[PDB]
Amino acid sequence: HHHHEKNITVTASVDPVIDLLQADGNALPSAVKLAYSPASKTFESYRVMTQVHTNDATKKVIVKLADTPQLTDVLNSTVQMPISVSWGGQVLSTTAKEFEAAALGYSASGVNGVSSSQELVISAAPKTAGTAPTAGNYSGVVSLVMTLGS
Amino acid sequence: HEKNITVTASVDPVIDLLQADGNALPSAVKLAYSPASKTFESYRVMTQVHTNDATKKVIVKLADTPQLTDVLNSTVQMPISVSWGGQVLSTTAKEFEAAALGYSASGVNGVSSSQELVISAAPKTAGTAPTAGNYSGVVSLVMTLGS
Amino acid sequence: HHHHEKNITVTASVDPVIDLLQADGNALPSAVKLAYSPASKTFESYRVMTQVHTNDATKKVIVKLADTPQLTDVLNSTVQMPISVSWGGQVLSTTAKEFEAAALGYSASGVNGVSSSQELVISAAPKTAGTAPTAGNYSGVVSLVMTLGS
């Protein structure tokens, strides 16, 4: 008699060669929010455990940021705070870092092609410590580029 | 210091499917594809029927056959599959008897025992990777109370 | 080689003086969805554990709502279900309530400038008490305003 409808939008970003997924099998979120503490004068970092999945485990995994990430006041371009990104214990930047199979622990993981868990950390700090940031809403993009080759 | 929290709700006063933990189901899910295993990680959540009448059957169908479609290329699609209460769902409705849904084992009036909801997808051809891109689709659940 | 770009938008709402974070450090969510049960005829309350982070732990904290929050039918603005908000064991309102420093347990927390944890509860009720709500999609905003007193 009564008809109830429920629409759930399903999405996927597919890469056939390489991707970085959460260690729990989920997709990484497209957006994260960092909290700033007026008490500790620091941001609470975003930390997530991830695994690289690849279609060839004989190749090297190369990781770099497409650009230097910044939190920028959405009302004032001039007002910025740097973002720091670490993955698998390595500070990432615009200069590429190479990760070899042994170091990614492919054999350890237990499914072929998939790395051991590595932590991804995204965080931020004010440009100069001691000086509190200016109030506002801030935005930026961590552009993670990862390549397979050799 | 202003802090804004948007709060929403979708209300059905006769029947709804909620999470088994009491939360609402999400309006959207994101599925991860692994280039290593060539498969998608399924979305799995335990659910309960909440209903104004627990003596009726619950009939469940999909309004349309769900697909993941390349946002930039309509011609490139992958099938989505949906399971509920241990049954593969389709455009043809499945009937769940009131007794099967375990209302008397739940211990809460009008709340069914838990039933797993599974959404997943697979490449069009098994063992062959799909093409790179961003894909999207709707699972359109239709549930009715029998008379 | 093959390159896969993955862009993660990072945002922050920065307040230098005072802010309310989740008790685990993360930012509060920007949105919550309340379930309505046709079985119990109630909305499930959203509850989250929170801490005040402040640059002065000696000051009273004043908390109010900017407007009386409503769950309003997105198709009909005249169908409003009242939203109720409590924080730290107090029902909040557009009329301010004050929380003394001593009461917020800054000195019981392990951390300078961080209060003891305080529960935030958001819930709602039907437009007319004792009568089920009409089917629809509803939306509203809980605007929380918090300043330091004396």
UniProtKB/Swiss-Prot annotation, chain B:
The keyword Signal applies. It comes from the Bacteria. Fimbriae (also called pili), polar filaments radiating from the surface of the bacterium to a length of 0.5-1.5 micrometers and numbering 100-300 per cell, enable bacteria to colonize the epithelium of specific host organs. It is found in: Fimbrium. Induction: CFA/I fimbriae are only expressed in the presence of the positive regulator CfaD. CFA/I fimbriae are rather rigid, thread-like filaments of 0.5-1 micrometer, with an apparent axial hole, and a diameter of 7 nanometers. A single CFA/I fimbria consists of about 100 identical protein subunits. The lineage of its organism: Bacteria, Pseudomonadati, Pseudomonadota, Gammaproteobacteria, Enterobacterales. Its main location: other. Belongs to the fimbrial CS1 protein family. This is CFA/I fimbrial subunit B. The keyword Signal applies. Transmembrane segments: none annotated. InterPro entries: Fimbrial_CS1-type. It comes from Escherichia coli O78:H11 (strain H10407 / ETEC). One of its GO terms (cellular component) is pilus. Keywords: Fimbrium, Plasmid, Signal.
